[PDB]
Design a protein around this ligand. Structure first.
Ligand SMILES: Nc1ncnc2c1ncn2[C@@H]1O[C@H](COP(=O)(O)OP(=O)(O)OP(=O)(O)O)[C@@H](O)[C@H]1O
Ligand SMILES: Nc1ncnc2c1ncn2[C@@H]1O[C@H](COP(=O)(O)OP(=O)(O)OP(=O)(O)O)[C@@H](O)[C@H]1O
Ligand SMILES: [Mg+2]
Ligand SMILES: [Mg+2]
Lengths: 118, 141, 141, 117
């Protein structure tokens, strides 16, 4: 068995670390969005790290849910940084300047440095 | 040689993964690059989702019809639906253009199809359906 | 839930594996046992193979037709061919019975179908074709 | 072939067939060819079948196996199957045609029962 996409959510004092594993498509997207906004309400997060290291697949629907969380966190004086981007995912980001708006960092420790938490 | 397949399934989000799995295993017989494969899976996912959220407006009772035809190193994908149709195909294909902004749609779908395939033909008639054709040459080692 | 799928392909041996993969993916949505999945993969193999080697006497222009509908834990599998047909369906169901023993056919196909599924109905008309209906409730924890 | 890797090794009058992958009609054809091919270029008395890496098997598997079995009976030799998963064992018991063929635990026990190992 399996969940087409695994969603590991970790909360470090005002910082939300989201590690994805598996495939990220329309179906799987709705789930992620649901789980994230759920934490952003039960807690007051101001910084988000999205680890796409273990992400096997992603389509336009991925770009969407990602660009969504961006807006969501931004509208609260918060910042989001994406790290561990596979060439495949990156190749999608490069399809339109609009996505150069999302900060991409190599590993996770640099994602946090980019947020000003380490 | 000339293998060909036809798949039809309920317009339900889980079947996007399904269609990717299916078209992949079928095209597998051509021993493609990891990228070539990923590009094909990706594109199938793009057109099938369009059928589901745009053509059928998430109504699972709608039917998405796929068709893959391998022949002479080329892959010929087809994705159609007897859905709502595209009023302006021209505009619909422009990057960032979407009619579902309330649903976190980036409007990249078509642009991804054009960048990953050797040819993309979109046929559509209002109140009839949408049929997307996608031709993909496979670098044979 | 209710999800339906329809697959049509050429009567080629490579496709026996293809159908196994496709069907298994579609039925994975019911999160069944590995055994349940293996049983379902096997049965699909038996029926598709039969259609190819018996239904179409290995003629690659024949069209095997599979259609799975999963709903509320039960699986409705259907394998059909517009082939040669079965003269005496009752005889053909007998374990070890076969009409092509010189081709190392064991005559275990149907016996496997009837035992890996909850119900099996074989319908056929000589020269029209053959249709095998296989039902199966997927135990859910 | 496809989805099935065949590993052949000959030991003084015994053919060792190691299968890894899925075995169905299509793939079984490739197996029958490759094996009867060795039986033609060499004098094989016995056959040890190692199904340890066998992911899947349908009736075609029961067929190709009993197919070799006959080739060996005609030469007075015997066949030994080992490392059989429960799924495969089920198709063996179910067909009942395997009360004949010898089944061992590993390649050593099989070879051993033959005399070599
Ligand atoms: N099958 C279809 N039926 C009806 N309209 C369609 C169909 N496919 C695409 N469209 C229309 O064309 C526009 C197309 O493209 P894209 O595929 O880029 O859209 P999105 O679905 O809005 O984008 P993304 O897939 O990146 O989220 C859609 O927003 C929709 O208005
Ligand atoms: N699609 C079909 N078209 C025509 N005849 C068929 C079809 N499916 C099954 N049969 C007939 O039914 C008989 C039975 O089944 P089984 O399916 O047990 O046969 P085999 O194919 O001979 O056996 P095995 O699959 O174990 O090698 C076959 O030998 C064949 O003559
Ligand atoms: Mg789209
Ligand atoms: Mg059979």
């Amino acid at each position: 068995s399996h969940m087409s996409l695994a969603i590991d959510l970790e909360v470090k004092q005002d910082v939300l670390i989201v590690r994805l594993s598996g495939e990220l498509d329309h179906h799987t997207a709705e789930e992620l969005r649901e789980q994230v906004t759920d934490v952003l309400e039960n807690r007051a997060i101001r910084h988000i790290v999205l680890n796409l290291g273990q992400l096997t697949f992603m389509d336009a629907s991925g770009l969407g849910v990602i660009l969504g969380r961006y807006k969501q966190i931004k509208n609260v004086g918060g910042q989001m940084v994406v790290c561990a981007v596979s060439p495949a995912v990156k190749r999608l980001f490069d399809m339109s300047g609009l996505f150069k708006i999302i900060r991409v960092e190599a590993d996770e420790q640099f994602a946090l440095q980019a947020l000003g938490v380490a | 040689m000339r293998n060909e397949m036809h798949l039809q399934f309920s317009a339900r989000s889980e079947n996007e993964s399904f269609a990717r799995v299916t078209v992949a295993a079928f095209v597998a017989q051509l021993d493609p690059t990891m990228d070539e494969l990923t590009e094909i899976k990706t594109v199938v996912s793009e057109a099938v989702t369009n059928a589901i959220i745009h053509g059928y407006n998430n109504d699972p009772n709608g039917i998405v019809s796929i068709s893959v035809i391998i022949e002479d190193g080329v892959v010929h994908l087809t994705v159609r639906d007897e859905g709502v149709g595209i009023p302006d195909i021209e505009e619909a294909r422009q990057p960032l253009f979407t009619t579902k902004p309330e649903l976190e749609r980036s409007g990249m779908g078509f642009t991804i199809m054009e960048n990953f395939m050797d040819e993309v033909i979109v046929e559509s008639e209002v109140n009839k359906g949408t049929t997307v054709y996608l031709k993909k040459h496979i670098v044979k080692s």
